[PDB]
Scaffold this motif. Structure first.
Motif, mmCIF file in Angstrom:
data_model
loop_
_atom_site.group_PDB
_atom_site.id
_atom_site.type_symbol
_atom_site.label_atom_id
_atom_site.label_comp_id
_atom_site.label_asym_id
_atom_site.label_seq_id
_atom_site.Cartn_x
_atom_site.Cartn_y
_atom_site.Cartn_z
ATOM 1 N N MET A 78 32.429 47.601 37.878
ATOM 2 C CA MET A 78 32.351 46.076 38.004
ATOM 3 C C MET A 78 33.038 45.002 36.793
ATOM 4 N N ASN A 121 36.054 44.912 36.790
ATOM 5 C CA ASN A 121 37.043 44.514 37.435
ATOM 6 C C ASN A 121 36.080 42.746 37.378
ATOM 7 N N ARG A 122 35.539 42.575 36.360
ATOM 8 C CA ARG A 122 34.644 41.263 35.417
ATOM 9 C C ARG A 122 35.841 41.405 35.005
ATOM 10 N N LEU A 130 39.056 39.567 36.233
ATOM 11 C CA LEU A 130 38.360 38.420 37.823
ATOM 12 C C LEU A 130 38.121 37.285 36.016
ATOM 13 N N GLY A 145 45.230 43.125 39.558
ATOM 14 C CA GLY A 145 44.466 43.463 41.105
ATOM 15 C C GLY A 145 42.221 43.719 40.791
ATOM 16 N N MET A 146 42.372 45.197 41.041
ATOM 17 C CA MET A 146 41.286 45.511 41.158
ATOM 18 C C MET A 146 41.600 47.855 40.445
ATOM 19 N N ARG A 182 35.329 30.184 44.549
ATOM 20 C CA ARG A 182 36.645 31.346 44.971
ATOM 21 C C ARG A 182 36.827 31.738 46.464
ATOM 22 N N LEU A 228 48.067 36.413 43.491
ATOM 23 C CA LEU A 228 49.094 37.256 41.804
ATOM 24 C C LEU A 228 49.820 36.335 41.788
ATOM 25 N N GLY A 237 44.785 32.640 41.218
ATOM 26 C CA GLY A 237 44.593 33.402 40.384
ATOM 27 C C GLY A 237 42.354 34.197 40.156
ATOM 28 N N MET A 253 40.547 39.701 43.890
ATOM 29 C CA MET A 253 41.284 40.067 45.271
ATOM 30 C C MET A 253 40.458 39.802 46.618
ATOM 31 N N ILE A 286 34.359 42.960 45.424
ATOM 32 C CA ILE A 286 34.036 44.321 44.612
ATOM 33 C C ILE A 286 32.850 44.885 45.189
ATOM 34 N N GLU A 338 32.325 48.028 47.059
ATOM 35 C CA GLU A 338 31.609 48.949 46.318
ATOM 36 C C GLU A 338 30.476 49.790 47.484
#
Ligand code: A5A
Ligand code: A5A
Ligand code: ZN
Ligand code: ZN
Lengths: 904, 905
Positions: free
Chosen positions: A650, A653-654, A657, A715-716, B597, B656, B711, B715, B740, B744
């Motif tokens: 988390m 990737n935060r 962002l 990216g991620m 987003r 990107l 950006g 993703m 995310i 997950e």
RNA sequence: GGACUCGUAGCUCAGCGGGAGAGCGCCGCCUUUGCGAGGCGGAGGCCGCGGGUUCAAAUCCCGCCGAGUCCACCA
């Protein structure tokens, strides 16, 4: 060795009333300002005198002494520095801080880098495990201690001060502390360690080496002009003042307590006594008189171990009037107390500055001190946990640590689990080996702890229990620590083919986006093509290597791998071979270089995340990205829960962002270390006066290489696999950008193709899978019951199909089945008091089975049946088993039974 | 009432026109002469120009337009190029029915200024409403270009009104060849598209060539005037409507028998040459038979009945041909004309981005494909529909946004999608012939309605199998229209209790800042309204801008956020600050960002789908639920996994690149001229000024919050792809921390399943298949073993069974579940056993009776069912049921004996 | 936009509250002189997924998923 100048160049000693003389046995020259009296200060000739009559003008505290020493040298011209971590993050040779000068080698000592200030002052805490065995036995030795110091870096032609003005000042401070100039002795000696050595004189007062003033000039080198302790040192250009003051020993001589332990951390010592099994009372006046004599002469008996130890033990006990076999009711248990008290303090700084216990590396030394400390708590049967002692050490010192006490306890609690567990499997190995060996060498004990996790002290008891004779040498534990104190050179195969080219330029530092370059070539030997001005990225780590082709007027040349040697670049070429001196232009494969950048940026983000989520004890061991894979290794005591795994991914990737800037520029080491901290060397230590600083968010690391401009270019990050390679370290597997999508896409495909073969929705896969599984277990458990019931019924249908004889249901049938069926059937027929036999036309010879719940013997029956059908077997009274060569009809089955059943 | 406006035309009176009442249709008209016509005569007139071109020289499709277009361009009119045939800019209609429809209703209500004033354009139009005429009347088309010129007049100033309008018309007519006296002007009311008004139909050569409307009326729920069922009110804005049939203009200049023969002769020729048509076009007979058939065609359209055979005989005998023979040329020609016209309509539908569906707008395209295919079968056409459509692209010479390769793939799909359906359908019909052994209307309406099978096919199949049939020809639309229900009638929005003028929100130019500083204006219930805000009201499940609303006293919070036009709504559950003290407010950062987003990423995916798939895809729907999102686009079939993959690939390429996303208010007229009709995929926003949003490349009219750059969207992961309806596809996705958490969450479901079977997450499927295969085996083996238990059990009881007239009866209480009892009995019945068995259960006891002989088991169940009060039933051999009172063997056997005694003699 | 129909063996489907079946296809043996069929036998089923009703659900109701069709400012 001996150069007359340094001994007499002193304009202070000789001209302020100092004289020196050598005694026969010791043979070393010591400067005394008291001509009337002559003392020495080494074990064979001296005893502590200041106990009871504190040499100082006043008892001082450990935290009030720091300032009094630091503020003093603050107004003399020295600058103040903050303490370094007890772990050597800044150097490559050793793991732990050995000295205060060890903070500045080999980069400031070899003059490569400047000092933070000149001159400088510091109260640097060090861990010296060489003097480990001497801790508790002499009363003057500690594993962890703050070495007060004040250095001055001098280059050819310039200096702040030299030996004269300072020893002077050194003598002055003592005069300002209540010590007359004549009571001080300066025993001349050499001092070495850390690769730097030099002649010194050790300040002795009350028969105690409280200080040490080293004037080092020699750097370690194979040339070895001088020979010190088997190590080869050699003179350097610049010279540097290296002083060492024991905070620990200064407070002791101020308060005037028996030992240094009662002076520094009395609360712990007093606490250990009260909650351990020690018999004597520390408050009692009788004991205090013993302790005074026991401590005042403890300096020599520490260096003594054997029967010669008893030669002093016998003499020391009588002066008090109490027997030798009774003195050891205190001195032997107090050693165990003094050691545990000190060692626990060392645990604080070790774990507090980010050490994680392991079977190797710097974590080994952490584990070692905990392992031994755990053992000492079982010899004292302490009602307290080891953590409870640390709690006091922290508050007594008043220091602030990177690693919180919350983290400290979880480690100490996890280690006793592992310690007690690794013991159970050990004792059986000990008790077996002590009967074959019948003796214990020096090597047997070292083999025991490293290989099987068994403390030395535990091994001696089991040795004594079963008659074996054991030889514990001096510094038995120090041998353990020293043999694992060397940070291995991590040496990999190096190739340095003489190209006669000492120059090389690099171009990918300024902008990693720049993917193509232009320059001339001189490459000649091997398959490698050396270019003076190249922007390729080489690495000895196998991968992280750039890739591309080269075209000139003569054709094309392809470079698959790129290596490096002696700061010079190498370019492997498979295909045509370029002509030397050609104006060429190289092209990097866009994807491959872009991938490294995206991935490398991710690695620095992940390390920040792990640190932010779990704790500040996280440091990195290694890093490698495989084809379609990637890994990061960090220090952690346990395998992270899936709750934590989610928190990691988390946060990483935060940061993506947020798209935070990723700056890179060169900074001065001293300017860099001061700005961020020693987190800067997590991925290794770069040389040079200026290094390359990389920042991916709040993460700052010396990482010369390729990166993105922002965190959002990555990216991620998706972690693929998490496992524990070794105690203390955990390996992550991750991937970002293109590899992130592919990894995530693959997880779908598995989830999709698994839920689709159960005709259920993927969201309901977990609950439906257990449903299918729990049924698979039940219906399997069900089948073997139906088969039992078939036998339960086939029995009931055969008791009815049986004719009666002498009030006994005798059944004789020919059925189609296998051997087990006949046995599983007859065992149930004999359970219903039935007699008779069965036969099956199985492939080959005819299988036969008999049975009887009654008194008639089954095997006896088979014998009679056997000679009619040509065959035999065996069995018991209730059932029998055999096989014949021909099948027998039911009518002819009955008459044999009736014949047999009648006679008995 | 209506005469007052027709009579005001000064031109007609001044230039020698005169208003007459024809005694046949009871309607009035105008003519530039009394005696040259000597007409009309009962009941209506036919074509005259067939063989006699009204114009000086023969024109062509291209030649006609440029003459007409230049005609008005040089006379001051403004030339605007044609709209697509699809209704993109309108939510009311599906396809463009008239040239004026390109401006309804915003331009036609005065809300937005026209592109220019006046205007002129050859605009393509589709009218599938009047199809039944097409093919027979010889003047109708499914698709046609409607040349026009429009004036837009505001209160006080006009460009030109009805007087000038007719004048501009007559000139174009007279300057072309037709004399002023040949032209007729019929008075007919006109309505459509929400705007109505008095109109004049212009008829030359016996054909309606033009039509013009003077829109004084627009539709309203309270309208005083009434036309075509709906209600209209007087407009304060008057618009000049005109419309010239391009195809009919060309036809008259060529003097060909049909309009079909003038527009696309080649297309018609291609069909006839390769068809099964019984004749040759070159012969004198067909040329002569058609030349007169075409003349009397215009009557057979507006008037359909039994007298058609009388008119048929009239034209037949006047040309002297046997009545069946005329049909031998007339009937096959009608199919040819329709098909040739249908294919031309097909072209523009796909070409302007209409994707064939089973419902909605797409079904219009499908239906047209269906009919085109049916005609090709009757004609036994040797070419595919694409070949015919391909010609029109060349003949008409137009450029479309949608490629022709895409078109063929759509035709090949829809053709196969039909042949699949008719097969599935035909086989169903046959299966009725063997079950029903008769066909009837209740079935037949259901056959066509829910299986697409035309009425004729079923009868044809039924005659091939010789089944009774009836064809209700006029009862087709009734039951299709008969049954209905609607819940509510009122406007979409809840009208507010109190009102406050002139609200505003600055969050358009500022999405980057949340907090504001404004003051109170009014309060009502749980919700409140302020002067200015940065709160964006939610549409659908989500899109909510959530925030805590503080005061000068305490802190409050908003749960949901809605909107009333001219007022922001803030839903709260708690106390409320009065107007006296003005307050300030705060907005949740994390909640706001997630939607911004999703908003931007929504535009991005749409941009991806177009590039990956084709231009034919348009947003037909979009919304989101938190941690999720959806977007529907028009595509013919659910995408292959590779397509979905690269779509996801391309989407993440765009995140990107980090293209800046600008945003600015623009006026309607300038907004749509610069970009293209992709602007209205988000919706049709009422108003003069329109908020447009440039996300990287794609631009839309979005009044929602957005991101500064691509950006910030993070993703993007497509969660699910389902085909809502054939021709429309929905994409589920999420971006940012929502992406995310979704990946997950997806990862958990896999990890969790593996830790149940204790396997590697990579081997989970192949191990599950293993378990499943075994699970099917073990479920199957239990069945075999259970049968043996019963087979064994059955034989056990036969031995100890009481014998009753050589019939062995069994009555016992056994320990077995319901499925064993039932399996046991059916074995006992097979061996002639009689009686009942019971078993303890759960608050009940299962009872099963059985009989291999004449005795009926289901009767026995009640006989023992009186004893212990238990219901149940079953077949004659075995009967299942439960009971609340267990019975001993004696108690049972007492009943069994009693029952058996009843049924012998 | 409003509705309607259908999910059952590999395929086409029947059954529509109490034993999961037929046709074609698939594996084998029998008959044939009528090369391809005929005869006999067998394997092959979460009766789409999930809840409710009932003693009992392939079957009756509700929801989801999937495959279809028509109608349409009426919807
Ligand atoms: C200054 C030089 N670099 C040096 O390290 N000298 S030293 O090894 O002797 O240590 C410096 C001071 O720390 C103290 N010290 C050394 N070893 C110690 C130990 N094992 N325990 C406690 N104090 C120690 C001594 O008082 C000593 O004067
Ligand atoms: C523009 C005006 N609002 C209008 O709709 N007029 S209209 O409905 O009467 O048709 C306009 C013109 O286009 C032509 N037209 C109308 N319907 C047609 C059709 N189904 N096929 C071919 N041409 C048609 C006629 O020549 C007609 O005069
Ligand atoms: Zn790095
Ligand atoms: Zn939008």
């Amino acid at each position: 060795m001996t150069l007359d100048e340094e001994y007499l160049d002193i304009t202070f000693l000789t001209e302020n009333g100092f004289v020196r003389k050598r005694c026969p046995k010791c043979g070393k020259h010591f400067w005394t300002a008291d001509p009337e009296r002559e003392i020495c200060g080494d074990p064979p000739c001296e005893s502590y005198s200041f106990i009871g009559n504190p040499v100082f003008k006043k008892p001082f505290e450990l935290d009030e002494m720091r300032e009094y020493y630091l503020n003093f040298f603050e107004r003399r011209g020295h600058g103040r520095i903050e303490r370094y971590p007890v772990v050597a993050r800044w150097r490559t040779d050793i793991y732990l801080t050995i000295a205060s000068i060890a903070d500045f080698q080999p980069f400031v000592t070899s003059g490569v880098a400047p000092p933070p200030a000149n001159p400088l002052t510091i109260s640097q805490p060090c861990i010296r495990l060489d003097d480990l065995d001497s801790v508790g036995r002499t009363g003057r030795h500690l594993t962890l201690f703050e070495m007060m110091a004040h250095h001055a870096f001098n280059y050819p032609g310039k200096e702040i001060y030299w030996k004269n003005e300072t020893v002077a000042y050194c003598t002055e401070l003592l005069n300002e502390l209540g010590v007359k100039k004549e009571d001080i002795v300066y025993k001349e000696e050499p001092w070495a360690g850390g690769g730097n050595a030099g002649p010194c004189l050790e300040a002795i007062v009350g028969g105690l080496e409280v200080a040490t003033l080293v004037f080092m000039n020699l750097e370690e080198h194979p040339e070895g002009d001088i020979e010190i302790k088997g190590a080869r040192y050699r003179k350097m250009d610049n010279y540097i003042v290296d002083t060492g003051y024991g905070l620990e020993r200064f407070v002791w001589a101020s308060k005037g307590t028996p030992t240094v332990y009662d002076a520094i951390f009395p609360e712990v010592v007093d606490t250990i006594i009260d909650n351990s099994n020690v018999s004597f009372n520390r408050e009692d006046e009788r004991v205090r008189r013993i302790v005074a004599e026991s401590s005042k002469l403890a300096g020599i008996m520490g260096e003594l171990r054997g029967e010669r130890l008893n030669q002093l033990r016998k003499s020391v006990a009588d002066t008090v009037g109490v027997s030798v076999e009774e003195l050891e009711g205190i001195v032997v248990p107090l050693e165990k107390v003094y050691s545990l008290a000190d060692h626990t303090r060392c645990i604080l700084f070790m774990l507090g500055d980010g050490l994680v216990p392991s079977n190797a590396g710097a974590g080994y030394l952490a584990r070692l001190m905990i392992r031994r400390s755990l053992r000492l708590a079982e010899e004292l049967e302490l009602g307290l946990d080891l953590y409870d002692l640390v709690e006091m050490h922290k508050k007594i010192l008043g220091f602030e640590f990177d690693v919180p006490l919350s983290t400290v306890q979880e480690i100490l609690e996890l280690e006793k689990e592992r310690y007690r567990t690794t013991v159970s499997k050990g004792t059986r190995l000990v008790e077996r080996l002590v009967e074959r060996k019948k003796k214990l060498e020096k090597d047997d004990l070292i083999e025991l702890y490293d290989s099987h996790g068994i403390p030395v002290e535990l091994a001696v008891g089991i040795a004594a229990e079963k008659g074996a004779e054991v030889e514990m040498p001096k510094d038995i534990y120090a041998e353990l620590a020293k043999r694992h104190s060397k940070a291995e050179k991590v040496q990999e195969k190096k190739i340095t083919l003489q190209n006669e080219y000492p120059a090389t330029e690099k171009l990918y530092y300024d902008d990693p986006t720049l993917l193509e370059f232009e320059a001339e070539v001189i490459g000649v030997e091997g398959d490698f093509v050396i270019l003076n001005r190249s922007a390729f990225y080489p690495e000895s780590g196998g991968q992280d290597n750039d890739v591309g082709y080269l075209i000139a007027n003569g054709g094309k040349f392809e470079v698959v791998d790129v290596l490096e040697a002696d700061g010079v670049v190498l370019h492997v070429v498979k295909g045509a071979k370029p002509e030397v001196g050609t104006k060429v232009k190289g092209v990097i494969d866009s994807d491959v270089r872009w991938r490294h950048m995206r991935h490398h940026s991710a690695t620095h983000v992940l390390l920040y995340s792990l640190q932010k989520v779990l704790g500040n004890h996280v440091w990195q061991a290694g890093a490698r990205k495989e084809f379609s894979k990637a890994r990061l290794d960090v220090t952690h005591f346990r395998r992270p829960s899936e709750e934590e795994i989610k928190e990691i991914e988390m946060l990483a990737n935060r940061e993506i962002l947020a798209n935070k800037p990723i700056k890179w520029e060169w900074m001065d080491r001293i300017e860099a270390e001061r700005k961020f901290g020693f987190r800067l060397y997590q991925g290794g230590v770069p040389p040079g006066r200026k290094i390359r600083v990389v920042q991916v968010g709040d993460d700052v690391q010396a990482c010369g290489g390729t990166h993105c401009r922002s965190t959002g270019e990555i990216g991620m990050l998706k972690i693929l696999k998490v496992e524990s390679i070794q105690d203390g370290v955990i390996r992550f597997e991750f991937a970002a950008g293109e590899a992130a999508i592919e990894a995530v896409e693959e997880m779908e495909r598995l989830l999709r193709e698994a839920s689709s073969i159960l005709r259920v929705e993927p969201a309901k896969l977990p609950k439906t899978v257990e449903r299918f599984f729990e049924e698979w277990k039940d219906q399997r458990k069900e089948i073997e019951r139906l088969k039992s019931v078939i036998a339960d019924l086939w029995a009931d249908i055969l008791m009815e199909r049986a004719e009666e004889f002498d009030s006994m249901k005798v059944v004789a049938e020919v059925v189609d089945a296998d051997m087990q069926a006949l046995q599983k059937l007859a065992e149930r027929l004999a359970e219903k008091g039935a007699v008779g036999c069965l036969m099956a036309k199985g492939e080959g010879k005819v299988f036969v089975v008999t049975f009887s719940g009654q008194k008639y013997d089954a095997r006896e029956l088979l014998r009679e049946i056997g000679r009619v059908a040509k065959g035999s077997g065996g069995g018991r009274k209730d059932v029998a088993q055999g096989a014949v060569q021909q099948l027998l009809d039911r009518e002819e089955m009955l008459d044999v039974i009736f014949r047999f059943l009648s006679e008995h």
